[PDB]
Scaffold this motif. Structure first.
Motif, PDB file in Angstrom:
ATOM      1  N   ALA A  43      36.355  81.952 -43.774  1.00  0.00           N
ATOM      2  CA  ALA A  43      37.249  82.291 -42.666  1.00  0.00           C
ATOM      3  C   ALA A  43      38.475  83.048 -43.162  1.00  0.00           C
ATOM      4  O   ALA A  43      39.605  82.776 -42.751  1.00  0.00           O
ATOM      5  CB  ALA A  43      37.658  81.050 -41.870  1.00  0.00           C
ATOM      6  N   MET A  47      42.893  85.372 -48.025  1.00  0.00           N
ATOM      7  CA  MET A  47      43.516  86.679 -47.888  1.00  0.00           C
ATOM      8  C   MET A  47      44.667  86.798 -48.871  1.00  0.00           C
ATOM      9  O   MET A  47      45.466  85.875 -49.037  1.00  0.00           O
ATOM     10  CB  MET A  47      43.996  86.891 -46.449  1.00  0.00           C
ATOM     11  CG  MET A  47      45.010  88.023 -46.166  1.00  0.00           C
ATOM     12  SD  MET A  47      46.616  88.123 -46.990  1.00  0.00           S
ATOM     13  CE  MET A  47      47.567  86.969 -46.008  1.00  0.00           C
TER      14      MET A  47
ATOM     15  N   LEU B  17      54.952  90.217 -45.362  1.00  0.00           N
ATOM     16  CA  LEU B  17      54.147  89.395 -46.237  1.00  0.00           C
ATOM     17  C   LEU B  17      54.200  87.935 -45.821  1.00  0.00           C
ATOM     18  O   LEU B  17      53.210  87.230 -45.969  1.00  0.00           O
ATOM     19  CB  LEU B  17      54.635  89.553 -47.669  1.00  0.00           C
ATOM     20  CG  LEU B  17      54.429  90.952 -48.301  1.00  0.00           C
ATOM     21  CD1 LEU B  17      55.183  90.999 -49.612  1.00  0.00           C
ATOM     22  CD2 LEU B  17      52.949  91.233 -48.520  1.00  0.00           C
ATOM     23  N   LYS B  20      52.410  87.876 -42.643  1.00  0.00           N
ATOM     24  CA  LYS B  20      51.017  87.956 -42.987  1.00  0.00           C
ATOM     25  C   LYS B  20      50.582  86.627 -43.504  1.00  0.00           C
ATOM     26  O   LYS B  20      49.591  86.091 -43.042  1.00  0.00           O
ATOM     27  CB  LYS B  20      50.736  89.029 -44.020  1.00  0.00           C
ATOM     28  CG  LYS B  20      50.971  90.437 -43.509  1.00  0.00           C
ATOM     29  CD  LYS B  20      50.697  91.467 -44.590  1.00  0.00           C
ATOM     30  CE  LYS B  20      50.900  92.925 -44.108  1.00  0.00           C
ATOM     31  NZ  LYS B  20      50.659  93.965 -45.163  1.00  0.00           N
ATOM     32  N   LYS B  21      51.363  86.022 -44.389  1.00  0.00           N
ATOM     33  CA  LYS B  21      51.019  84.721 -44.885  1.00  0.00           C
ATOM     34  C   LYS B  21      50.883  83.786 -43.721  1.00  0.00           C
ATOM     35  O   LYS B  21      49.950  83.001 -43.703  1.00  0.00           O
ATOM     36  CB  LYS B  21      52.068  84.193 -45.844  1.00  0.00           C
ATOM     37  CG  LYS B  21      51.760  82.835 -46.448  1.00  0.00           C
ATOM     38  CD  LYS B  21      52.908  82.419 -47.368  1.00  0.00           C
ATOM     39  CE  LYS B  21      52.817  80.968 -47.792  1.00  0.00           C
ATOM     40  NZ  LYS B  21      53.904  80.625 -48.766  1.00  0.00           N
ATOM     41  N   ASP B  24      47.685  84.727 -41.726  1.00  0.00           N
ATOM     42  CA  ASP B  24      46.509  84.322 -42.437  1.00  0.00           C
ATOM     43  C   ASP B  24      46.476  82.818 -42.528  1.00  0.00           C
ATOM     44  O   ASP B  24      45.408  82.221 -42.427  1.00  0.00           O
ATOM     45  CB  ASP B  24      46.492  84.927 -43.832  1.00  0.00           C
ATOM     46  CG  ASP B  24      45.248  84.563 -44.660  1.00  0.00           C
ATOM     47  OD1 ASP B  24      44.154  84.937 -44.321  1.00  0.00           O
ATOM     48  OD2 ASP B  24      45.406  83.866 -45.639  1.00  0.00           O
ATOM     49  N   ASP B  28      43.864  80.582 -40.708  1.00  0.00           N
ATOM     50  CA  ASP B  28      43.257  79.409 -41.245  1.00  0.00           C
ATOM     51  C   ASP B  28      43.678  78.148 -40.518  1.00  0.00           C
ATOM     52  O   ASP B  28      42.868  77.269 -40.362  1.00  0.00           O
ATOM     53  CB  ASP B  28      43.396  79.324 -42.753  1.00  0.00           C
ATOM     54  CG  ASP B  28      42.646  78.105 -43.296  1.00  0.00           C
ATOM     55  OD1 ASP B  28      42.029  77.385 -42.497  1.00  0.00           O
ATOM     56  OD2 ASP B  28      42.709  77.875 -44.475  1.00  0.00           O
ATOM     57  N   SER B  31      41.080  78.494 -38.196  1.00  0.00           N
ATOM     58  CA  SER B  31      39.716  78.387 -38.707  1.00  0.00           C
ATOM     59  C   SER B  31      39.462  76.969 -39.117  1.00  0.00           C
ATOM     60  O   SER B  31      38.348  76.459 -38.968  1.00  0.00           O
ATOM     61  CB  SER B  31      39.498  79.283 -39.919  1.00  0.00           C
ATOM     62  OG  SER B  31      40.093  78.722 -41.063  1.00  0.00           O
ATOM     63  N   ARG B  34      38.976  75.077 -35.995  1.00  0.00           N
ATOM     64  CA  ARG B  34      37.649  75.273 -35.488  1.00  0.00           C
ATOM     65  C   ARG B  34      36.693  74.438 -36.302  1.00  0.00           C
ATOM     66  O   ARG B  34      35.879  73.742 -35.727  1.00  0.00           O
ATOM     67  CB  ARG B  34      37.226  76.727 -35.521  1.00  0.00           C
ATOM     68  CG  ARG B  34      37.911  77.596 -34.486  1.00  0.00           C
ATOM     69  CD  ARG B  34      37.268  78.918 -34.349  1.00  0.00           C
ATOM     70  NE  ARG B  34      37.335  79.709 -35.582  1.00  0.00           N
ATOM     71  CZ  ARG B  34      38.354  80.519 -35.950  1.00  0.00           C
ATOM     72  NH1 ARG B  34      39.434  80.637 -35.212  1.00  0.00           N
ATOM     73  NH2 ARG B  34      38.255  81.208 -37.074  1.00  0.00           N
TER      74      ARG B  34
END
Lengths: 56, 57
Positions: A43, A47, B17, B20-21, B24, B28, B31, B34
């Motif tokens: 998933a 990154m 960043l 973005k962290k 992401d 997660d 994710s 889920r």
């Protein structure tokens, strides 16, 4: 006196045993070797930043 | 100006960043939620199926 009954019992149990033997052969041939797989998921969690590909 | 502009490109890059962290990490969080719900659902179902298996037992 008991001959026919003995014969029928033997034949019947033999038929049942034959069917169980023939099916158990197939079940026995390969058992763990038809086992499962892994299907690991990430998933995108790993990154790290920008990428060479153009989607981002 | 260059110092503020640069301090900004750096606060802003650190922000992109960090964002973005967060994106992401949040990708997660989601994710994981889920998977948690898929696994909790499989667990509840394992437990429903267990209760059923036990009832069928």
């Amino acid at each position: 006196m008991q001959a026919l009954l003995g014969a029928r019992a033997k034949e019947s149990l033999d038929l049942r045993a034959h069917l169980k033997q023939v099916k158990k052969e197939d079940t026995e041939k390969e058992n763990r070797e038809v086992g499962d797989w892994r299907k690991n998921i990430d998933a995108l969690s790993g990154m790290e930043g920008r990428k060479k590909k153009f989607e981002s | 100006l260059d110092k503020y502009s640069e301090a900004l490109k750096d606060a802003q890059e650190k922000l992109e960043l960090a964002e973005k962290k967060a994106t992401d990490a949040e990708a997660d969080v989601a994710s994981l939620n889920r998977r948690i719900q898929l696994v909790e659902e499989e667990l509840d179902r394992a437990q429903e199926r267990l209760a059923t298996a036990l009832q069928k037992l």
